Ligand binder design. Structure first.
Ligand SMILES: Nc1ncnc2c1ncn2[C@@H]1O[C@H](COP(=O)(O)OP(=O)(O)NP(=O)(O)O)[C@@H](O)[C@H]1O
Ligand SMILES: Nc1ncnc2c1ncn2[C@@H]1O[C@H](COP(=O)(O)OP(=O)(O)NP(=O)(O)O)[C@@H](O)[C@H]1O
Ligand SMILES: CS(=O)(=O)Nc1ccc(CC(=O)N2CCN(c3ccc(Cl)nn3)CC2)cc1
Ligand SMILES: CS(=O)(=O)Nc1ccc(CC(=O)N2CCN(c3ccc(Cl)nn3)CC2)cc1
Ligand SMILES: [Mg+2]
Ligand SMILES: [Mg+2]
Lengths: 352, 352
């Protein structure tokens, strides 16, 4: 049976697949054509159907897992298309996490004899994050930050060492946001969450701009000026609010200039996309900072797929966390940010 | 000169006016017709021009202030119409607070010989809040809460004693949100703020629904179902997420169902208004709870005009704070919630 780990989220299904590369002569004979067809289908295609994608650049090559050498592959598709995935599977032991492991349990069991083992979505996140950091990204650091995040002429991605990862605040930005405090490999808590997450960005963007993909929303936002929609401190005070250290450029009221009809009539879709992105990202950063101060943790790592191909939000988080914390907190990022739950699920396989 | 206190905010101007009622025979003679015209204009009208309103029900009658007996009146109009107010004034010492005291300083000085004294917006809030609570609301409590906020057959407004008000977390929901920790009458700090405030509600509502007043946005929201727009925990898990105590009804992703085109096509304007209100209010409640836990304060009072005639948001705050804190925090409300800055400014008059 193939070794798969699956994280079925509110928006995306993430799949980690271990392809063995040490297949001996006898093992290849004693393999059923169905298994060979699966392996060849997955390794010879980068798109699967109309909505599945293999993230080839994330592949971990020549990993030793469960005593075998192989390549770890990372695959995603929308949860909306899980019926297609299951139907293909109908025409093995599955470690699955995320809410969909529960919601679609009965659907997975329409696959004859399949054994479904549900694992907790935050247990899997912590286990997968710690594992990937431990084995490295093909010899490169899994974890990085933006050095000198306050000056754009200097700001650059740089590696960060997590050899002693504890304590750690993990901010998981998916459909919503979950915030975890990790104190040891077996001691962690869900501190809180917020419902202003990636699904809010995409949902509001679609309502406001008519965009029909995450990537299109980001492209619009890169062209926009959020200050056309937001009311800034300087719009209220005429400058800084000096007494409490609020600079004139800080947002006082997100979308607050949209209470004026003439401003609603002149704002562009790109401006509204950028204001949505800035609003969601700043709120996540601020909640992360408050949790970090309360948990007495100074390293904050952001994961989840809201940040995939989203350098705007990563740089905003890096700058905002550093600026508003007076340098006490650092925003950390991970190359495999969307996939840790799926890896953690795969790692649960020996228990079954 | 008339005794006025003014708070010029990003959205509304709030004015407190002390009308003396112990005017002797000689004082009435030695009063200039301009002053008499002002007093009669203010006390004989409840609407001023097209956008000014006197909140008659908030009037404090027979208050002793600066050694005189009088009535304290509460008046509001949009900051957008401040040019009209100043032009009327051109055709006295003014204690003014809010950002507009700085932004419009030069405009106020077009009134000949007028002495403008700028006072800090959060100093004035604390002073005015403590003062009004101290003198009472015409013998009734200024402060109230919703008793048994978890059961609607029981939930009812009840008075709350703030005789020993410290410590206190003050959540000021205006255009944006400011959060204050008040430890004594002269010891308080701005803990943080969020830009997801009343201006976000009104701005997003106008973009999404075409409403053109705060009151119309609230009326739409009262008719809506926010779960048509929001993705809930049960939409992701099929039920509760038991492991971390998340009930199926909790919002996992605000507007998160709007990533689906078919759902964007069936949602009503009333549903979007309600989802906007719920999103903003829950985020404010959650930020308040985190600040309360970090400041080690268990009494949280909400002020500002986002909550005027807004019982939906007050009940949501009351319920959410009690539910998510496991009963450790209580949401408190104040009858004069929008006007404390203007009163605090008026109270600064003896210093000039
Ligand atoms: N191709 C995409 N399609 C949809 N959303 C995308 C895509 N790429 C990036 N995103 C963003 O990724 C977010 C979902 O991130 P993800 O970490 O996969 O969440 P999830 O696990 O499916 N949700 P959750 O149940 O809350 O844990 C979406 O809300 C988008 O903001
Ligand atoms: N008649 C109204 N017109 C406009 N907004 C109203 C009205 N009534 C209630 N509101 C709400 O009141 C909020 C403004 O509250 P308010 O406490 O007066 O803020 P402000 O002081 O003007 N802003 P700030 O500069 O941030 O302190 C608006 O964002 C609305 O959500
Ligand atoms: C695991 S998931 O897949 O279902 N995703 C997921 C599920 C839920 C959430 C939101 C969350 O965690 N909430 C809700 C908000 N909340 C409040 C609200 C008002 C107050 Cl006063 N206090 N707290 C705290 C708890 C985020 C993401
Ligand atoms: C006094 S006013 O009239 O001008 N109104 C007013 C002014 C400003 C604000 C927002 C605020 O206080 N902010 C900004 C957000 N912020 C962040 C952001 C990212 C991170 Cl990582 N951390 N913190 C904290 C500080 C609210 C209301
Ligand atoms: Mg997830
Ligand atoms: Mg104000």
């Amino acid at each position: 049976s193939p070794w798969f780990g699956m994280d079925i989220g509110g928006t995306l299904v993430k799949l980690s697949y271990f392809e063995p590369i040490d297949i001996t002569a006898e093992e290849e004979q004693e393999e059923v054509e169905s298994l060979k067809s699966i392996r060849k289908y997955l390794t010879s295609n980068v798109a699967y159907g109309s909505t599945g994608i293999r993230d080839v650049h994330l592949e971990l090559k020549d990993l030793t897992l469960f005593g075998r050498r192989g390549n770890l592959h990372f695959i995603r598709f929308p949860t909306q298309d899980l019926p297609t995935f299951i139907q293909m599977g109908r025409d093995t032991v599955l470690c699955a996490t995320g809410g969909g492991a529960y919601k679609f349990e009965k659907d997975f069991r329409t696959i004859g004899n399949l054994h479904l083992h549900k694992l907790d979505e935050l247990d899997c996140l912590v286990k997968g994050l710690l594992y990937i950091d431990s084995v490295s990204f093909n010899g490169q650091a899994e974890c990085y930050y933006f050095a000198n995040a306050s000056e754009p002429e200097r700001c650059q991605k740089m590696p960060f060492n997590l050899d002693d990862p504890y304590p750690l605040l993990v901010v998981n930005i998916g459909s919503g946001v979950s915030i975890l405090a990790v104190h040891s490999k077996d001691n962690y808590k869900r501190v809180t969450g917020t419902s202003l997450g990636g699904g809010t960005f995409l949902g509001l963007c679609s309502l406001l701009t008519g965009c029909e993909s995450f990537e299109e929303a980001l492209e619009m936002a890169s062209k926009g000026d959020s200050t056309q929609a937001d009311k800034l401190v300087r719009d209220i005070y005429g400058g800084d609010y000096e007494r409490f250290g609020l600079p004139g450029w800080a947002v006082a009221s997100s979308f607050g200039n949209m209470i004026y009809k003439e401003k609603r009539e002149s704002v562009s879709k790109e401006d509204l996309a950028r204001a949505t992105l800035v609003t969601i990202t700043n709120n996540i950063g601020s909640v992360a900072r408050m949790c970090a101060v309360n948990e007495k943790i100074n390293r904050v790592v952001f994961v989840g797929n809201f940040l995939r191909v989203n350098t705007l939000s990563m740089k905003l988080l890096a700058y905002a966390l550093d600026y508003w914390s007076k340098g006490q907190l650092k925003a950390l990022f991970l190359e495999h940010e969307g996939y840790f739950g799926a890896v953690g699920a795969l790692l649960g396989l020996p228990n079954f």
